[PDB]
């Protein structure tokens, strides 16, 4: 361990945000991304928007 020091991010899969609650996340207000989350029916994206 004291030789190789891999970091690894805690939200690698970009879907972990839908299950974790210790990291807040948001988008620009009044933008294309907010409307995309507001309208998309994808299950994971529905979770993020919710």
């Amino acid at each position: 361990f004291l030789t190789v020091e891999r970091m690894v991010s805690p939200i690698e899969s970009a879907e972990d945000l839908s299950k974790q609650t210790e990291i807040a996340y948001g988008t620009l207000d009044s933008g294309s991304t907010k409307e995309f989350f507001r309208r998309s029916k994808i299950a994971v994206f529905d979770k993020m928007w919710t």
């Binding site: 891999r6 690894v8 899969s13 972990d16």
Partner: protein
Amino acid sequence: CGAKDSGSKEKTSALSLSNVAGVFYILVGGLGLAMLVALIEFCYKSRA
């Protein structure tokens, strides 16, 4: 499908028990064998 490896990663971490599990098997086998040897030696030395 349910392989789905996620969450805490042992690869970034310690040896699991599965890496050294053979040593515990050897240890308990040795303990059982030692109790067996003691019992057969006692059985020999007893009844007389």
